[PDB]
């Protein structure tokens, strides 16, 4: 014909971005309950004064200053808080 | 079967056969023999044979090269050279199919001072190109 009709793709789908990542970095002063990192799995583990939610959201269990550190035999990344 | 030609140099010997007590008939076996020929011939992938014939050409000494070239050009493999006093005598099995009009061509290369005597030699396998041409 004058023009050749094309096909169709089968890859159009994608899901919404979940806004994961670190919310407060090292040195941030946070209130109790502040979300530090939103995660899939425990890439960062909960240290002192830090709690882990059902979806592994790390949140502050006290007022203070955020600190990242590496601890344990496995060199895992822990998030703790110095109470200030 | 391949191209409607009289098959030659074929050797067949009958060893096994079956017949029906009341239906045994000479015509049946005759037709059955033809059937057997068909399958056997196909699997043997036959090759057409051309009438390769020996050719003897006499020519002046100075034109020996011209003669050799033409003989070779016509897919003919030479088998002998005779250094006769009055010119050289050459021999070759030029394919008959290829050799047509050779007399006229030969004269120009030998200043019209040569001649040839033809005698059929043997039917040989045709080259792929030539064989296919005849098949089609």
């Amino acid at each position: 014909a004058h023009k050749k009709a094309g096909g169709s793709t089968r890859n159009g789908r994608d899901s919404e971005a979940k806004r994961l990542g670190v919310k407060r970095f090292g040195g941030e002063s946070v209130l109790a309950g502040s979300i530090i990192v939103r995660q899939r799995g425990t890439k960062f583990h909960a240290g002192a004064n830090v709690g882990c939610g059902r979806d592994h959201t790390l949140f502050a269990k006290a007022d203070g200053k955020v600190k990242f550190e590496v601890k344990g035999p496995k060199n895992r990344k822990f998030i703790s808080i110095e109470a200030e | 079967p391949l191209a409607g030609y009289p098959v030659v140099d074929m050797g067949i010997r009958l060893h096994f056969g079956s017949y029906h007590d009341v239906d045994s008939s000479e015509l049946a076996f005759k037709l059955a023999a033809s059937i057997a020929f068909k399958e056997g011939f196909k699997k043997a992938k036959p090759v057409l044979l051309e009438p390769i014939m020996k050719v003897e050409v006499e020519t002046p000494e100075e034109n020996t090269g011209d003669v050799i070239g033409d003989l070779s050009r016509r897919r003919g493999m030479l088998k002998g050279q005779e250094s006769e006093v009055t010119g050289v005598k050459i021999h070759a099995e030029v394919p008959l199919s290829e050799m047509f009009g050779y007399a006229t061509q030969l004269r120009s290369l030998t200043k019209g001072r040569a001649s040839y005597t033809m005698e059929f030699l043997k039917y040989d396998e045709a080259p792929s190109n030539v064989a296919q041409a005849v098949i089609e």
Binding site: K3, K4, G6, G7, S8, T9, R10, N11 | -
Partner: protein, 136 residues
Amino acid sequence: MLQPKRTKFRKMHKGRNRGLAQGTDVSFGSFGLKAVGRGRLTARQIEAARRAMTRAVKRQGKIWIRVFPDKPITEKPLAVRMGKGKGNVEYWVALIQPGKVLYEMDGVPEELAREAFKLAAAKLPIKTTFVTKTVM
């Protein structure tokens, strides 16, 4: 026709051909063909060069292909408009950076290897040069 036997995915982004090469030394044979320019070598290009290069040395020595076509290239058919998904994979290519050794050769004299690589480089779109093995 060099081509991966299977691939994790059948199509790949266009990408960019930046940087210098890895594998700039004659590591296997004694002589080598080294790419001076950058570009794409199709499997047909690599294989055509290999035929000339292996045939040049009269099937002597040993021949090493140092490059592999692992990048699939898609082409939209003639007279189709833009969009309607990505095109179909037509051929494979290897990306070539300046300095990469494409072919290696051993077991043959240097003057013959030089001539063989000349015929082989006549088939390649990218500028080449002749290199030999060195002790580091």
